[PDB]
Amino acid sequence: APDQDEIQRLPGLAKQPSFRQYSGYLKGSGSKHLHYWFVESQKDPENSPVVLWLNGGPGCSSLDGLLTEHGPFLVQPDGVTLEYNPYSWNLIANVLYLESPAGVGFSYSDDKFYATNDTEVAQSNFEALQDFFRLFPEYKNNKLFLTGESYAGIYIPTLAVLVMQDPSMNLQGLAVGNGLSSYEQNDNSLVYFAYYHGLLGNRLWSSLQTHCCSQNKCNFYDNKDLECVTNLQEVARIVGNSGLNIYNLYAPCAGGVPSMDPPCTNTTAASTYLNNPYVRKALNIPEQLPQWDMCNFLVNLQYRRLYRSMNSQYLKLLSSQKYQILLYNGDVDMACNFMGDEWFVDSLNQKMEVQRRPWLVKYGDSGEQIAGFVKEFSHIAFLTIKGAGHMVPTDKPLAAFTMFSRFLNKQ
Amino acid sequence: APDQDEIQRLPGLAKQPSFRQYSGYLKGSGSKHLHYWFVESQKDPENSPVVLWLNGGPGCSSLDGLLTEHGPFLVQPDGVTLEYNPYSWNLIANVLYLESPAGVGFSYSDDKFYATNDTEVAQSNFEALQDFFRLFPEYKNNKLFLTGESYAGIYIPTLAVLVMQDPSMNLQGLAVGNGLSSYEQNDNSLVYFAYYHGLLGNRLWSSLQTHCCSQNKCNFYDNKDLECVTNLQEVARIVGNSGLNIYNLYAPCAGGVPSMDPPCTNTTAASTYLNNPYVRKALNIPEQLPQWDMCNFLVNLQYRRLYRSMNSQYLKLLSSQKYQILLYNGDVDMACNFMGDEWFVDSLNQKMEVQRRPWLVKYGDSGEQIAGFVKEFSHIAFLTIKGAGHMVPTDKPLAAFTMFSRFLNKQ
Numbered sequence: 075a076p077d078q079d080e081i082q083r084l085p086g087l088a089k090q091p092s093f094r095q096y097s098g099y100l101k102g103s104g105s106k107h108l109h110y111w112f113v114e115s116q117k118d119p120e121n122s123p124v125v126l127w128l129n130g131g132p133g134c135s136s137l138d139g140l141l142t143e144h145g146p147f148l149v150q151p152d153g154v155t156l157e158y159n160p161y162s163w164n165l166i167a168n169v170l171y172l173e174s175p176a177g178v179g180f181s182y183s184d185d186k187f188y189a190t191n192d193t194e195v196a197q198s199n200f201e202a203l204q205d206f207f208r209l210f211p212e213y214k215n216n217k218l219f220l221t222g223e224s225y226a227g228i229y230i231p232t233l234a235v236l237v238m239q240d241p242s243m244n245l246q247g248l249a250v251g252n253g254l255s256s257y258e259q260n261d262n263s264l265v266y267f268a269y270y271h272g273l274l275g276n277r278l279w280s281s282l283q284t285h286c287c288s289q290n291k292c293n294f295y296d297n298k299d300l301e302c303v304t305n306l307q308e309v310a311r312i313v314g315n316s317g318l319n320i321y322n323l324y325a326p327c328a329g330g331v332p333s334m335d336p337p338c339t340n341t342t343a344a345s346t347y348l349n350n351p352y353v354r355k356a357l358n359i360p361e362q363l364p365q366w367d368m369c370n371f372l373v374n375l376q377y378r379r380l381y382r383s384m385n386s387q388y389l390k391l392l393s394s395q396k397y398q399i400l401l402y403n404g405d406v407d408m409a410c411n412f413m414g415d416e417w418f419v420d421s422l423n424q425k426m427e428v429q430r431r432p433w434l435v436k437y438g439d440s441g442e443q444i445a446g447f448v449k450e451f452s453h454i455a456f457l458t459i460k461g462a463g464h465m466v467p468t469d470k471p472l473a474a475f476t477m478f479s480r481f482l483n484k485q
Numbered sequence: 486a487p488d489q490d491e492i493q494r495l496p497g498l499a500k501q502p503s504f505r506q507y508s509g510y511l512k513g514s515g516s517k518h519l520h521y522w523f524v525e526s527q528k529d530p531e532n533s534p535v536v537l538w539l540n541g542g543p544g545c546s547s548l549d550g551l552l553t554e555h556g557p558f559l560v561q562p563d564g565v566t567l568e569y570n571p572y573s574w575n576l577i578a579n580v581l582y583l584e585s586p587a588g589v590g591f592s593y594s595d596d597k598f599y600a601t602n603d604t605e606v607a608q609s610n611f612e613a614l615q616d617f618f619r620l621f622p623e624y625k626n627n628k629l630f631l632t633g634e635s636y637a638g639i640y641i642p643t644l645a646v647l648v649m650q651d652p653s654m655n656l657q658g659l660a661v662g663n664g665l666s667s668y669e670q671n672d673n674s675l676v677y678f679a680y681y682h683g684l685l686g687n688r689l690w691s692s693l694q695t696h697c698c699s700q701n702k703c704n705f706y707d708n709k710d711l712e713c714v715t716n717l718q719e720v721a722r723i724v725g726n727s728g729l730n731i732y733n734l735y736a737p738c739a740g741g742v743p744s745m746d747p748p749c750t751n752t753t754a755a756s757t758y759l760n761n762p763y764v765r766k767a768l769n770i771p772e773q774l775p776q777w778d779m780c781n782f783l784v785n786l787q788y789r790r791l792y793r794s795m796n797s798q799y800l801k802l803l804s805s806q807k808y809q810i811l812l813y814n815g816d817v818d819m820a821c822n823f824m825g826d827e828w829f830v831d832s833l834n835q836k837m838e839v840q841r842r843p844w845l846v847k848y849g850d851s852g853e854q855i856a857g858f859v860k861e862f863s864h865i866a867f868l869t870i871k872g873a874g875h876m877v878p879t880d881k882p883l884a885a886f887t888m889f890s891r892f893l894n895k896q
């Protein structure tokens with residue numbers, strides 16, 4: 075490990091971690107410096123898997139994952155106190171939170187040119203992974219898992235196809251949380267999700283059926299009927315610009331209904347904590363770097379999307395038969411709704427189709443509870459988390475942890 | 486008012502109510518004695534509306550409504566303490582909770598014959614209402630509202646048609662919470678609700694489409710295709726006997742997943758409180774009467790359902806143009822799902838169709854929030870409560886209270 079990157083005293087913690095943690099920079103492609111934060115397994119790190127975590131956007135910080143989703147400690151609303159997370163994914167894994175691509179959070183490049191695309195982010199992320207294993211050569215042999223959320227539905231399978239060609243990397247699987255797998259399948263599934271969750275009436279529904287659909291099949295993705303393109307625009311206003319939280323339909327919109335920062339979300343606690351000078355010092359962040367934001371508007375603004383489907387990435391990964399893949403969706407998210415990703419996994423037409431069943435979690439008091447539904451194929455599973463939104467570990471941490479543990483243990 | 490029915494000191498309250506409340510018996514048909522609990526408006530009772538409340542079952546106690554939904558005080562988990570309810574419907578109304586029909590809770594008959602049907606429950610409820618106005622003649626002139634939940638979707642429109650013929654009763658409207666309006670529309674809507682809430686996969690969905698449906702229209706109600714009747718049976722196992730809370734999909738099943746008392750619900754607090762001898766004395770319950778249960782299995786067991794649709798009751802009530810009607814559904818209930826009741830109200834084909842829009846509530850902190858969706862016709866509105874289950878006021882009390890206030894004020 076690089077001893078100069080080790081965090082010794084993290085502001086806002088009342089007890090010192092039982093585990094070693096590092097903050098520094100992985101070399102991406104060209105002049106890119108990707109800020110990492112590595113937290114070793116609370117149990118047997120030497121042999122616990124290494125787990126890459128990517129948040130999406132594009133241009134959103136993986137440190138959101140650490141401080142608000144499944145990190146070893148979570149920022150409190152004061153933006154000062156960190157509290158230990160009993161459901162931390164680092165209970166059983168060495169977790170690498172990577173700010174990616176360049177310009178996101180504390181990540182930067184010397185040429186300070188932050189315009190990028192899916193193929194370049196994969197290649198840079200791949201080079202940062204190689205840099206990680208040069209700094210942490212004691213972790214080269216551990217099981218590697220590539221994981222992430224939302225746009226990491228593109229980041230992770232594109233990165234995975236690069237990693238499966240480097241035999242020095244012990245790739246065992248990938249997991250994508252509420253992931254963008256297929257624009258078409260997302261967009262089509264979202265319209266159904268809207269109607270059957272009571273957001274649209276029969277007036278607008280009956281009309282979409284008539285002008286967007288035929289022979290039992292609907293096109294809400296690239297459909298060109300005038301009335302169809304008109305109906306779908308009211309659907310976007312209702313879902314996206316009416317004051318519903320797109321990340322969790324049953325959650326309030328933070329800041330209330332309107333009469334980078336994601337809509338209906340409050341990033342103040344994390345921003346307050348990470349912009350503290352002493353927090354930056356503890357995290358070994360160069361003093362010259364601009365303020366930490368959750369999402370970089372400019373990376374988002376100048377980003378160029380290349381892939382519309384991950385069908386070929388997944389079938390490449392599945393054709394090797396070496397890797398276990400999990401796509402997991404909170405079933406009350408509307409940004410990357412569960413049905414779109416379930417359609418996606420089904421449309422891969424894989425073998426060993428093992429029947430859709432409920433999966434269970436024991437809650438300390440309430441006992442065994444349905445945590446969601448699972449569908450297992452050969453080397454790929456689709457899974458819902460019942461009552462979780464876009465940030466599954468934030469909404470349902472025990473279900474998120476149970477899912478993660480079972481995925482790692484291939485059981 | 487009958488002074489001998491007034492409750493003076495209710496066990497488990499730390500402060501005495503600002504309002505008068507009564508517990509005694511309304512004469513139903515024949516030898517039926519229906520136990521009532523009347524709570525006068527906390528504000529200007531003399532002029533506040535009179536509001537009948539019925540819980541459903543059949544055979545479930547309206548005292549569930551008082552002590553766990555929208556009463557002036559709510560039982561705590563100790564089953565001893567009552568705590569004042571800041572969202573009590575009795576803030577602005579004289580609320581009559583009626584245990585109905587005979588044998589439910591503290592209700593009884595001398596002949597002790599508890600087998601009944603929809604037409605007899607209406608007639609008996611109608612006679613109890615007449616008895617109420619003989620005991621409370623000072624409330625004859627106040628605006629009367631008929632309200633209830635679940636099977637009261639049948640109780641209330643059947644009772645309403647009897648009440649609209651007695652000119653001595655000042656009927657202004659009715660409101661039905663998560664109500665059974667049409668078996669067909671419930672059953673058909675529930676199957677869609679199941680699939681689009683991620684409870685069924687494409688295997689079972691694709692099959693239902695093929696064997697239960699045609700020309701864009703599905704029959705999940707009375708359909709006879711062998712495969713259809715087979716698919717619908719897996720749907721009932723998943724929805725009803727897998728460990729999902731049928732009353733609130735996103736809530737845990739009380740008692741955990743299985744490997745009268747409703748499934749996945751814990752009635753202990755209310756039962757503990759109402760079975761206390763001193764509580765019975767305060768509530769003027771005859772010592773001879775058997776124990777209080779939330780739901781009477783036997784009334785349920787011997788009950789005979791007569792109506793399959795309330796279409797004719799509602800069109801009778803609407804044809805007068807004298808009454809305002811509200812059907813309100815928690816949109817995560819599966820026992821009487823919102824879509825079935827929205828289809829129902831739409832299929833009444835009324836006039837003044839006023840466009841489906843979100844409705845708002847101001848939460849003290851979080852500010853203005855979408856509380857659900859509303860569709861206003863002439864004299865009838867359909868309304869969802871976003872994230873509420875079967876017991877709307879239990880899950881979303883401020884949204885329940887706001888809805889109620891606006892319904893009463895005809896605004």
Ligand SMILES: *[C@@H]1O[C@H](CO)[C@@H](O[C@@H]2O[C@H](CO)[C@@H](O)[C@H](O)[C@H]2NC(C)=O)[C@H](O)[C@H]1NC(C)=O
Binds near residue numbers: 150152341342343
């Ligand atoms: C967004 O989050 C911030 C930080 O959690 C909230 O600010 C806090 O408000 C509480 C309530 O009074 C205070 O006790 C804290 O001291 C505040 N924290 C800070 C660092 O100022 C803020 O209210 C939230 N805003 C919205 C609209 O949800």
Ligand SMILES: *[C@@H]1O[C@H](CO)[C@@H](O[C@@H]2O[C@H](CO)[C@@H](O)[C@H](O)[C@H]2NC(C)=O)[C@H](O)[C@H]1NC(C)=O
Binds near residue numbers: 561739740
């Ligand atoms: C059902 O509700 C009852 C009553 O609320 C629960 O019993 C209580 O459990 C808590 C937790 O220890 C105790 O503090 C209370 O004293 C208990 N109340 C009574 C009156 O015994 C019970 O646990 C619930 N059961 C389930 C499965 O949800």
